[PDB]
Amino acid sequence: SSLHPSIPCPRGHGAQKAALVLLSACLVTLWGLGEPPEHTLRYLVLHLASLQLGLLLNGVCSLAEELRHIHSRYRGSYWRTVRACLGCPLRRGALLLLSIYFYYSPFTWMLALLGLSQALNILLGLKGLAPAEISAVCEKGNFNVAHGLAWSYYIGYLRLILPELQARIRTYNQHYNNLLRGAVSQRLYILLPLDCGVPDNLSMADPNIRFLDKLPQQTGDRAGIKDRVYSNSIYELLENGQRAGTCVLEYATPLQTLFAMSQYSQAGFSREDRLEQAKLFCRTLEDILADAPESQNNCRLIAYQEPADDSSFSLSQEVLRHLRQEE
Amino acid sequence: SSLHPSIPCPRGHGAQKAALVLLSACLVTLWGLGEPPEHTLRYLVLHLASLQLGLLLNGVCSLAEELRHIHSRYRGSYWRTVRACLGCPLRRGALLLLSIYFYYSLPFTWMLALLGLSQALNILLGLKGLAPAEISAVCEKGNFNVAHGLAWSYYIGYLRLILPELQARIRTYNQHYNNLLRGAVSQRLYILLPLDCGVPDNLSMADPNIRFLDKLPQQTGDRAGIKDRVYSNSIYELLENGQRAGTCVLEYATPLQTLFAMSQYSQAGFSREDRLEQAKLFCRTLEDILADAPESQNNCRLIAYQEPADDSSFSLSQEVLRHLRQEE
Amino acid sequence: SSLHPSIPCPRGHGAQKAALVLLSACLVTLWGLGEPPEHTLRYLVLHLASLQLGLLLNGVCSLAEELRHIHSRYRGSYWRTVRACLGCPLRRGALLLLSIYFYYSLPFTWMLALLGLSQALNILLGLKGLAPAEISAVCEKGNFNVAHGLAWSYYIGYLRLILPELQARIRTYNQHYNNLLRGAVSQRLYILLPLDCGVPDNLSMADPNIRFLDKLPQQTGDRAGIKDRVYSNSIYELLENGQRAGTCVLEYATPLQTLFAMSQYSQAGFSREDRLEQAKLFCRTLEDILADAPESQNNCRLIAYQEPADDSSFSLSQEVLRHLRQ
Amino acid sequence: SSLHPSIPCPRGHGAQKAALVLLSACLVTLWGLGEPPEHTLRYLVLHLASLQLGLLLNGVCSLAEELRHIHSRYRGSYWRTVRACLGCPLRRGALLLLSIYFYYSPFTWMLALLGLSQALNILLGLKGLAPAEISAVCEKGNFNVAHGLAWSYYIGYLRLILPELQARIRTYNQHYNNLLRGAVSQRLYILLPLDCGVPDNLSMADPNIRFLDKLPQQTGDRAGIKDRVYSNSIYELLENGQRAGTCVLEYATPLQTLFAMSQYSQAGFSREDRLEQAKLFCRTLEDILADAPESQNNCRLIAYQEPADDSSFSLSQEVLRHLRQE
Amino acid sequence: SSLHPSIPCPRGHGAQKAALVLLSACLVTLWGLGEPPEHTLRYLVLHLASLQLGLLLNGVCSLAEELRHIHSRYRGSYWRTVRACLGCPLRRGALLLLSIYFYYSLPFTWMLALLGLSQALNILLGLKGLAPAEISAVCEKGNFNVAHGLAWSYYIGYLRLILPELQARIRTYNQHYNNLLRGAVSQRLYILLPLDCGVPDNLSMADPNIRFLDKLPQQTGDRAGIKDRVYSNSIYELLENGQRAGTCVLEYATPLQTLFAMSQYSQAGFSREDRLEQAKLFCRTLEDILADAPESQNNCRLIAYQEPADDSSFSLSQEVLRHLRQ
Ligand SMILES: Nc1nc(=O)c2ncn([C@@H]3O[C@@H]4COP(=O)(O)O[C@H]5[C@@H](O)[C@H](n6cnc7c(N)ncnc76)O[C@@H]5COP(=O)(O)O[C@@H]3[C@@H]4O)c2[nH]1
Ligand SMILES: Nc1nc(=O)c2ncn([C@@H]3O[C@@H]4COP(=O)(O)O[C@H]5[C@@H](O)[C@H](n6cnc7c(N)ncnc76)O[C@@H]5COP(=O)(O)O[C@@H]3[C@@H]4O)c2[nH]1
Ligand SMILES: Nc1nc(=O)c2ncn([C@@H]3O[C@@H]4COP(=O)(O)O[C@H]5[C@@H](O)[C@H](n6cnc7c(N)ncnc76)O[C@@H]5COP(=O)(O)O[C@@H]3[C@@H]4O)c2[nH]1
Numbered sequence A: 001s002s003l004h005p006s007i008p009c010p011r012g013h014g015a016q017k018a019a020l021v022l023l024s025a026c027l028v029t030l031w032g033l034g035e036p037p038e039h040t041l042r043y044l045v046l047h048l049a050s051l052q053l054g055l056l057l058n059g060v061c062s063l064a065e066e067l068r069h070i071h072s073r074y075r076g077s078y079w080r081t082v083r084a085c086l087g088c089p090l091r092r093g094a095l096l097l098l099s100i101y102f103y104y105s106p107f108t109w110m111l112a113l114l115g116l117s118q119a120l121n122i123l124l125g126l127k128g129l130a131p132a133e134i135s136a137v138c139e140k141g142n143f144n145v146a147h148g149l150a151w152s153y154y155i156g157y158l159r160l161i162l163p164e165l166q167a168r169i170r171t172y173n174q175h176y177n178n179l180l181r182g183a184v185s186q187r188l189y190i191l192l193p194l195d196c197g198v199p200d201n202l203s204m205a206d207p208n209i210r211f212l213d214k215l216p217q218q219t220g221d222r223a224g225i226k227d228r229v230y231s232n233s234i235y236e237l238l239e240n241g242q243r244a245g246t247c248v249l250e251y252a253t254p255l256q257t258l259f260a261m262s263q264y265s266q267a268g269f270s271r272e273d274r275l276e277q278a279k280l281f282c283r284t285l286e287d288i289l290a291d292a293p294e295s296q297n298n299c300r301l302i303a304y305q306e307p308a309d310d311s312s313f314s315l316s317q318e319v320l321r322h323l324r325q326e327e
Numbered sequence B: 001s002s003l004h005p006s007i008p009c010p011r012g013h014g015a016q017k018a019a020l021v022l023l024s025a026c027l028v029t030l031w032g033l034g035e036p037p038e039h040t041l042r043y044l045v046l047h048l049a050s051l052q053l054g055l056l057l058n059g060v061c062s063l064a065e066e067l068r069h070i071h072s073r074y075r076g077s078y079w080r081t082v083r084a085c086l087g088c089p090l091r092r093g094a095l096l097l098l099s100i101y102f103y104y105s106l107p108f109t110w111m112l113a114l115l116g117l118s119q120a121l122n123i124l125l126g127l128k129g130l131a132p133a134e135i136s137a138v139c140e141k142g143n144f145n146v147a148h149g150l151a152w153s154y155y156i157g158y159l160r161l162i163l164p165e166l167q168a169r170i171r172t173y174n175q176h177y178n179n180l181l182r183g184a185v186s187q188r189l190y191i192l193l194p195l196d197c198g199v200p201d202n203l204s205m206a207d208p209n210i211r212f213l214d215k216l217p218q219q220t221g222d223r224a225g226i227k228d229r230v231y232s233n234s235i236y237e238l239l240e241n242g243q244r245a246g247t248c249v250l251e252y253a254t255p256l257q258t259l260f261a262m263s264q265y266s267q268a269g270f271s272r273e274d275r276l277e278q279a280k281l282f283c284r285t286l287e288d289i290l291a292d293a294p295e296s297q298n299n300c301r302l303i304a305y306q307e308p309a310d311d312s313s314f315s316l317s318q319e320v321l322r323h324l325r326q327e328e
Numbered sequence C, E: 001s002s003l004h005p006s007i008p009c010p011r012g013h014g015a016q017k018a019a020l021v022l023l024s025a026c027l028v029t030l031w032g033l034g035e036p037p038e039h040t041l042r043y044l045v046l047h048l049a050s051l052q053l054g055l056l057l058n059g060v061c062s063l064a065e066e067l068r069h070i071h072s073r074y075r076g077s078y079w080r081t082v083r084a085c086l087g088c089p090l091r092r093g094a095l096l097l098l099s100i101y102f103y104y105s106l107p108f109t110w111m112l113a114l115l116g117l118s119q120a121l122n123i124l125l126g127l128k129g130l131a132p133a134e135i136s137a138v139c140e141k142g143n144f145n146v147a148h149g150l151a152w153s154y155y156i157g158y159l160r161l162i163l164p165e166l167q168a169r170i171r172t173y174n175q176h177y178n179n180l181l182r183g184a185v186s187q188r189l190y191i192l193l194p195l196d197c198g199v200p201d202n203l204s205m206a207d208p209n210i211r212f213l214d215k216l217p218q219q220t221g222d223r224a225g226i227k228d229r230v231y232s233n234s235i236y237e238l239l240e241n242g243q244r245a246g247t248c249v250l251e252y253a254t255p256l257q258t259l260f261a262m263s264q265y266s267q268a269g270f271s272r273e274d275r276l277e278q279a280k281l282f283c284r285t286l287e288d289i290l291a292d293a294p295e296s297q298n299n300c301r302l303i304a305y306q307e308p309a310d311d312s313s314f315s316l317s318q319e320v321l322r323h324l325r326q
Numbered sequence D: 001s002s003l004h005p006s007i008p009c010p011r012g013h014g015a016q017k018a019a020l021v022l023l024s025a026c027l028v029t030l031w032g033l034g035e036p037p038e039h040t041l042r043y044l045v046l047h048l049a050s051l052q053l054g055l056l057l058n059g060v061c062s063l064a065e066e067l068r069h070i071h072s073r074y075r076g077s078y079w080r081t082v083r084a085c086l087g088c089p090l091r092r093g094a095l096l097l098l099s100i101y102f103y104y105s106p107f108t109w110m111l112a113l114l115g116l117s118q119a120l121n122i123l124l125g126l127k128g129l130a131p132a133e134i135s136a137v138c139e140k141g142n143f144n145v146a147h148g149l150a151w152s153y154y155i156g157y158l159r160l161i162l163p164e165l166q167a168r169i170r171t172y173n174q175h176y177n178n179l180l181r182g183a184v185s186q187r188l189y190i191l192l193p194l195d196c197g198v199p200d201n202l203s204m205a206d207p208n209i210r211f212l213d214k215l216p217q218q219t220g221d222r223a224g225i226k227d228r229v230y231s232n233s234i235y236e237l238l239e240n241g242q243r244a245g246t247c248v249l250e251y252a253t254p255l256q257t258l259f260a261m262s263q264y265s266q267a268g269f270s271r272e273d274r275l276e277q278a279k280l281f282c283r284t285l286e287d288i289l290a291d292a293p294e295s296q297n298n299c300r301l302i303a304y305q306e307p308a309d310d311s312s313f314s315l316s317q318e319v320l321r322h323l324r325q326e
Helices: A014-032 A037-066 A078-085 A089-103 A108-124 A145-161 A165-176 A253-261 A273-290 A315-323 B015-031 B037-073 B078-085 B089-105 B109-125 B132-142 B146-162 B166-176 B254-262 B273-291 B316-327 C015-032 C037-066 C078-085 C091-105 C108-125 C132-141 C146-162 C166-177 C254-262 C274-291 C316-325 D014-032 D037-066 D079-085 D089-104 D108-124 D131-141 D145-161 D165-175 D253-261 D272-290 D315-324 E015-032 E037-073 E078-083 E091-105 E109-125 E132-141 E147-162 E166-176 E254-262 E274-291 E316-325
Strands: A188-193 A209-214 A218-222 A225-230 A233-239 A242-247 A299-304 B189-194 B210-215 B219-223 B226-231 B234-240 B243-248 B300-305 C189-194 C211-215 C219-223 C226-231 C234-240 C243-248 C300-305 D188-193 D209-214 D218-222 D225-230 D233-239 D242-247 D299-304 E189-194 E211-215 E219-223 E226-231 E234-240 E243-248 E300-305
Touching: A014 B037, A014 B109, A037 A078, A037 A089, A037 A108, A037 B015, A037 B109, A037 B132, A078 B132, A108 B015, A108 B037, A108 C091, A145 A253, A145 A273, A145 B146, A145 B254, A188 A273, A188 A315, A209 A315, A209 B226, A225 B210, A233 A315, A242 A315, A253 A273, A253 B146, A273 A299, A299 A315, B015 C091, B037 B078, B037 B089, B037 B109, B037 C037, B037 C091, B078 B089, B089 C015, B089 C037, B089 D108, B146 B254, B146 B273, B189 B316, B234 B316, B243 B316, B254 B273, B273 B300, B300 B316, C015 D037, C015 D108, C037 C078, C037 C091, C037 C108, C037 D014, C037 D108, C037 D131, C078 D131, C091 C108, C108 D014, C108 D037, C108 E091, C132 D037, C132 D079, C132 D131, C146 C254, C146 C274, C146 D145, C146 D253, C189 C274, C189 C316, C211 D225, C234 C316, C243 C316, C254 C274, C254 D145, C274 C300, C300 C316, D014 E091, D037 D079, D037 D089, D037 D108, D037 E037, D037 E091, D079 D089, D089 E015, D089 E037, D145 D218, D145 D253, D145 D272, D188 D272, D188 D315, D233 D315, D242 D315, D253 D272, D272 D299, D299 D315, E037 E078, E037 E091, E037 E109, E147 E226, E147 E254, E147 E274, E189 E316, E234 E316, E243 E316, E254 E274, E274 E300, E300 E316
Parallel strands: A188 A299, B189 B300, C189 C300, D188 D299, E189 E300
Antiparallel strands: A209 A233, A218 A225, A233 A242, B210 B234, B219 B226, B234 B243, C211 C234, C219 C226, C234 C243, D209 D233, D218 D225, D233 D242, E211 E234, E219 E226, E234 E243
16 A cells, blocks of 8 residues: 555445445335335345245255265265355254244245246356455455465565575675675665566666676575575666666566466466456565564565556666665 | 375366256146246246346445445446446346336335345345355366465476476486496486475484485576576485385475465464365366476376374385386 | 558447347337237247257257267267257256246147248258358457468467577677678568568569668577478668668568468468458457567567559558658 | 378268258158148248348347448448348348238237347347357368468478479489488378377487488578578488388477467467367368379378377387388 | 450349349239238249249259260269259258148149140240340359350460560560660560451551561470470561651460351351350450469550451551550
8 A cells, every 4th residue: 555556455344334325225215105014024034034045955956066075075074064065054954944934924836936046046157256246255265376475475585584684785795895886785675566577687677777796695404405595686776877876686476477377378367367466466465574573674665567658767766766765 | 186085176067967956846846736837937037037136236335335446456447347346237237127127017116125125134234145165166166276376386486497407417417426336316306295284394304214315416597687596406215124225306395385384374364274175276286287288297296195193104205115116 | 450540450349239229129119019018028938938949959950960970079978979069968958948848838749840840941941041240250259260370370480489589690790790881780670561462572573672681690490300490581771762771671471471372272262352351360460469478579560551552652661661760 | 081080071961861850750740730731831931031030130230340340341331241241132132021021921019029039139148159060160161270270381381392302312312322321212201190299309209219310401582581491301210229211200380389379378279179170180281182283192191199098109110100001 | 344345344233133123013013902911922832832843854854864974974873963963952852842742732633744744845845945145144154155265275375484484585685686776675565355356377467567576585395295395476666657666565366366267167166246255255354364363464465456347547556556655
């Protein structure tokens, strides 16, 4: 919500307010018309009971599938299989009895009609979920690709190199770097292009940044591999032909993974998905770094969207703009 | 499916067969009672029309919220918001226009008010939710998993980069530093997939008979603005009853370590059953990806194993050894 | 769409709006006349059910033929043979059961015989065909063209292979082999796409100004069992009013030559009015492919031109120079 | 039909035979039932007329889309648009005029119902085509990717290099080839794997394949490129570690294009379509080469299907067999 | 059409508009009278069925003669010899079944005997013939002329062989052998098409102004097993009012002379008025051939002239010079 105005905000409570207004208008309209309220009570109860019976029939129809994978998904219990499909059995049974008692007061004819309607819905696929209705059920439950990618990035990279970053910078400044050249600042800078176009060579896309030197590497043992290696680099920020400063630059590799996923046919990843996924990845990474012990005191996030008209946009300008708040 | 018996198979068509059986039973029952088919058909029509009019009210209630992020999710268009909330505006408009005519000619404002109350109560109280066994179906159908992203990341970042050059690395190590007195390192890199997500750091633990001998020549590349990214591997040997039996190139799968570590932090919202659910889906997706790649099963294939509950003296040395036997 | 005004735009949603207007008009007309609303519903249901009982007859007539290629197209599956003709055998079965129930209760054997005669006469006399403007939509929605394959072949075989290395050859030539007296050859290899499929072998003809200058260093590779496949290009000069104006790298598009030559052989079955529609579609597909390719328009330029019938003093040099200005 | 049993045969006339059987059964059933034939005639005529009116309404609905492409697709003419959407203005007009005259055998009510049903069919998508009908129309009208690819192959490669192969082989034998080395035979051998998996070099997939030497080049001018070059290769076939013979080997590059089209997502090309097009490309080449002047006397086609169980399939045996019955 | 106004334009759709007008007139006449709508339909159906039953007898009669050439025209297959006469045996069989069903249920053998007798009388007395204006359409739609074959043979044998090589001779002549004092011979090889079939052997006659100048270098090729086939041309001068005005190449068309000679022999059966319509058609066909050939009018020109009957001071020189103006 601060990285870029294009990043969305989490969903709120507009639906409940609209539902309340609709309920109030419906109640006022019912009061305006002349009728006793007992009919309203009876019809409302009957409608709710019919809805419950429809849900139960759908659950029984769906149970014909989940009983083929019992020994693989539900261990070996018939009681967990019915829990996955039919919510919570005890509440469902209580609602069953209440609905049957309130609906029995001809009658067997309507059960057949509900059966036909439910079977038609299952077969012909009349019922379904809108694109903005499955996008709000997988956001509260964390069923995203970018959620996993951001947590992987944090755990595997930033929880590892961030604590020991300043020691390497200090050693490079004293032991190796000469005093005549300018010192490299702290706070590793992460660039997050909200386009997933990550160039392999950073010298491209801007002639004003050139590769200067490297950093001492760090090693560790991870997942049965001895002496994994981590490395970084230092770049030069030319200002109108002369140097203006130095920094430590990186893109975000999961953006490259998203871009490469969007082109293979087997991935099943649309070209409209990997923009919302990039913005969601940026939001989640910012939230994770907000309250981590190795907080933004050691890294800064930069998000930019490439203008279509090329309005004299250069990466170096934005990088210097962000560098100028350090002091 | 063929990797381990515990891995589930994709869902097929069982709900449809149950639906046909229910449809046939309902049709026979309707035929078995005395009632004109005209009523049997017009009641069905009214039922369907009321369902559609309810869906529209739910959609408008959703739009009342979705119209707030207009400059952030839907660019600046009032029409993409409607397309996202209310399906397609032409088929939906036709269904509305046809629904009114049937429901207006066959106390008309009263039923609209009752539908409004029922829909508002559903939205507020929350009676209309999703069972955990259809959220799974839609997520698996549309590829909305954590393991999907993790598996594709693993492939694209590691295997697509190292599998082709493994032959040259092995050959150079063989003719340069490897002596014929010892067993030559076999081909076909081996990957272990513990369906517990418990990945120890060093392979010496958890089995005393796996000991680390030598490294391998490195590979270097440039990625995403980092100069000279390096990759390395290690070579392990298997000891049988005190005697060396062979030599392989062993590796765990790091995304499993990520899946395990994600389940301790409370900010992740990741349970302990979800970890087991995803660990058996990461393997399935990875095998499906490796089946149709040009760097096919001829260079490496997986080894899945589940730790016995009773701990009946499991020895992964035996599993890797028997895979070595079946290789030849 | 942006290359030439003559290139058509993709088909959209106009039939749906016309259908909505017709639906509204017929609904109002039905409301204006006097008839019970139940009769309209019953007749509409019966019509819809006959239109679905009349599709299984066509499906079975087709399945009488599709079962002769079982071992050659459908492995050995009776399930996959009936799945290619009769859509999906579950939704279709349910629709059949409901259709029978509705059409049997609302001389019942008489109507089946008449439906059989009507369907058989449709199949035999051929009254049920397709207009040229519905084939052109069903084969363009699903990518069933010749130009689609030709454009993807062009990309995969040529431009995915020479575009990335185009800088390392121009740069070497310009400094080692190009004399400082001559101007440097400009970047961005230029491709000419004549929407006539008339592709002359040598560029000297059809414009008496462009003249062959020299070649470029070539590159080699191994492909499909042949080793040392050689790619080479050439550099052309543009003489303005008798004097040089610049240099560039010029290419026609060979798939256009293939499209032209296909239209003269008799076994091709490819008409003279088709190799203009396909020529206009090939350019659109190339522009769409190069829009999102990593080896983007920073290395290549497209020039589409249609030769005037009246010879309105058209010269290729003017167009090439006009694009070189940018 | 000879290359491999898995290659399908072109579609025949089973639908017409099934239609005749259905018509005969319907006529016999109508004769068995008791009714005057006048009712049969009246109802059949009415059904056919209703079908014609439905087709006209669908055409008018579709015309609302093709009238915004008039200046691009159909030229400045208003008659070609109608001719494309409808099909035959004079015959259509006669059929409509004759059709509506038979209403004498609540009249606007039926027209309203027909319009409503047709609008529902257009909006709800109830008139789609099954894949085994789209396949039939595509194969009849030559709307395939493989058709274009095969014609491109023949026009661009074989029609250019086939005549000079004998001269190149003879010169290679006389100038360089020794008597101790086996003579390289004629008849360029083309392998057509019906799997689209084309390895970069033949040194893989069969250890018994060893690269021997090259062959003299060929040079020509095409599409403004000066001195395009062509090249081939010579391979040695080993039998149990000993030489058995030599030949001239090649894969089919359009198979590589077909394979690579199916990995990208923008191509919209499935994984069953790949196999179908691969098995159609071979049929089209066999048809083209059957009656060409540079006939099968200079090349041979070898189609092989990789066993699923991997029952020790060695491509060397496959080549050696055709070498034996050369 | 564009060469000379007397060349007829291709036949169009004019009978169909008259058919539409007649259909509308007869329909409104039926509407204006008093008669049941069903009786009109029944009588129309019976008339249509009788007209279809009256063709099977003719087909069987034609087959009774065509069966004697089964070993010479239809290999050995009865299916082909029955398909060559009775259309397609699938639509025809269904039509026959429907016709007999409608004719038998709606004195039955009396009509069969009368139809047979009428058909026998028609075939014997020859009452069913073909108008001269209908044969001229059926034999022009299907390319059943002599001019079509003559034009294609002329093109294939001469124009496809000398036209590309024409410039390489005239360019060399103009420098090596043509004196600078004499004007250079013009390009655009000219062919004269006299619409009279009168082709003199020598060009000196019929115009005392044109005189034979010199030769041209000849070319050699291999055709039809005879080698050293020599093609040579000639150059003529143009004398305007006693002084030289220009030089060009004049050519007649041998097929016109062949058409003229055909009209004289008795075994040819070629009438005097046929060699004029064929002469008209030949020019149109040849112009159509040259329109879309790759070797287009860039090397040739056509001149068509009709000799005036009154000798209105007509001279070939004026026409050829007016052509040389462009
Ligand atoms: N700029 C940069 N420099 C690094 O050294 C680095 N190391 C990791 N990363 C990114 O952080 C995350 C942590 O990787 P992890 O181990 O969890 O999964 C990794 C890991 O399973 C495997 N892998 C990648 N590199 C190696 C490697 N050197 N050795 C073994 N396995 C590797 O492939 C997965 C994806 O890697 P990347 O998709 O390129 O981006 C990674 C990843 O998103 C890095 N990013
Ligand atoms: N101007 C130009 N210079 C080139 O080097 C070149 N190479 C290819 N192309 C065009 O790009 C596409 C890729 O060719 P591909 O290999 O996929 O199919 C090719 C290939 O199967 C075969 N072929 C062509 N040249 C060779 C060749 N030297 N060796 C073997 N096969 C060849 O014939 C097919 C059609 O070739 P062209 O119909 O002339 O146009 C090609 C083609 O449209 C070129 N265009
Ligand atoms: N101006 C001119 N100079 C020529 O050399 C020439 N050669 C042919 N023609 C005309 O073009 C066409 C080519 O005829 P084709 O070869 O198909 O059959 C030829 C061929 O079968 C035979 N014939 C004619 N000349 C020769 C010849 N020198 N050698 C063998 N056969 C010949 O007789 C046929 C008709 O010849 P012409 O009836 O005199 O006019 C021809 C013809 O209309 C020529 N026209």
